[PDB]
Design an enzyme around this catalytic site. Structure first.
Site, mmCIF file in Angstrom:
data_model
loop_
_atom_site.group_PDB
_atom_site.id
_atom_site.type_symbol
_atom_site.label_atom_id
_atom_site.label_comp_id
_atom_site.label_asym_id
_atom_site.label_seq_id
_atom_site.Cartn_x
_atom_site.Cartn_y
_atom_site.Cartn_z
ATOM 1 N N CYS A 228 0.837 -1.448 0.268
ATOM 2 C CA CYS A 228 -0.042 0.108 -0.129
ATOM 3 C C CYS A 228 1.348 1.543 -0.115
ATOM 4 O O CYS A 228 1.976 1.581 -0.908
ATOM 5 C CB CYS A 228 -0.872 0.020 1.658
ATOM 6 N N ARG A 233 -4.025 -0.014 3.733
ATOM 7 C CA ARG A 233 -4.688 -0.229 3.177
ATOM 8 C C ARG A 233 -4.583 -1.755 2.651
ATOM 9 O O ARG A 233 -5.241 -2.648 2.361
ATOM 10 C CB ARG A 233 -4.880 0.022 1.911
#
Length: 272
Positions: A228, A233
């Site tokens: 990420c 994320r």
């Protein structure tokens, strides 16, 4: 599931024997006004990161953190939060890293909850200090730069950023600067974490999930590493791949692009 619980189940177990509800977000200002009854808070920046080094807390610190907060080894831990449950998923991963068995995520996070209009509490919470003991780090689920470098061609590399971050068109989401080079890791596949979740924030069926990642071109015969910008994320996707669809070897590259795009000499690929 054995790794995921519904808001209903949660609602009906607010005060069940050996079950601790924990809220995780990068800010923690949301908890300091409204939170699930009985819940305690872990601040992602101030509790889970190192004060000095670019790193998150180690075994010994993790243990003192959880002890001071009243979490015991045998507790069943329910994680939930804002920012699309990202940091709850980051915490989930820290937990698994230090060997916690009974850890479960709350489907939808703090956002499905608020949407179902479920009751929130503003009463301060403190539990008797525990005696928590973390296991030495399990790096089977963590990727470091060198092995990230050594992958490329060898492994599924899944970039969970937005397409514009992925292509190198933009450096970061929407707020500002991150590396000094835009783009992604050569060979990487772009599945923005977002596609793995419904409007409300809940995870999608294993049927939808397998489809999503098959379509994007995830090689089931290859080992996988997710990344990420800050692992933010990527731990959400990691949880999807390993915990929900159950791939055996999935690592989270916590270093992510903030490290990668700042390394000198590292291969880079622009466009999509």
């Amino acid at each position: 599931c054995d790794v995921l619980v519904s808001a209903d189940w949660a609602e009906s177990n607010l005060h069940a024997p050996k079950v601790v509800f924990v809220e995780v977000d990068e800010d923690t200002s949301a908890y300091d006004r409204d939170h699930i009854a009985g819940a305690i808070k872990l601040d992602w920046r101030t509790d889970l990161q190192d004060p000095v080094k670019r790193d998150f807390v180690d075994a010994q610190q993790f243990s003192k953190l959880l002890s001071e907060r009243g979490i015991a080894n045998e507790d069943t831990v329910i994680l939930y939060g804002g920012n699309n449950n990202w940091f709850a998923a980051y915490a989930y991963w820290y937990f698994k890293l230090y060997g916690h068995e009974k850890v479960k995520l709350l489907d939808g996070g703090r956002k499905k909850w608020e949407l179902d209009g479920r009751p929130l509490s503003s009463d301060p919470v403190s539990r008797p200090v525990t005696s928590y003991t973390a296991s030495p780090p399990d790096n089977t689920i963590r990727a470091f730069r060198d092995e990230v470098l050594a992958a490329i061609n060898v492994k599924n590399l899944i970039d969970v950023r937005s397409p514009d971050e992925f292509s190198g068109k933009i450096l970061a989401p929407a707020h500002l600067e991150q590396s000094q080079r835009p783009g992604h890791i050569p060979g990487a596949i772009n599945v923005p974490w977002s596609r793995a979740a419904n409007e409300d924030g809940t995870f999608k069926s294993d049927e939808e999930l397998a489809k999503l990642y098959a379509d994007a071109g995830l090689d089931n015969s290859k080992e996988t590493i997710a990344y990420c910008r800050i692992g933010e994320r990527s731990s959400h996707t990691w949880f999807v791949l390993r915990e929900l669809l159950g791939h055996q070897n999935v690592k989270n590259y916590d270093g992510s692009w903030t490290e990668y795009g700042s390394l000198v000499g590292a291969p880079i690929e622009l466009g999509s």
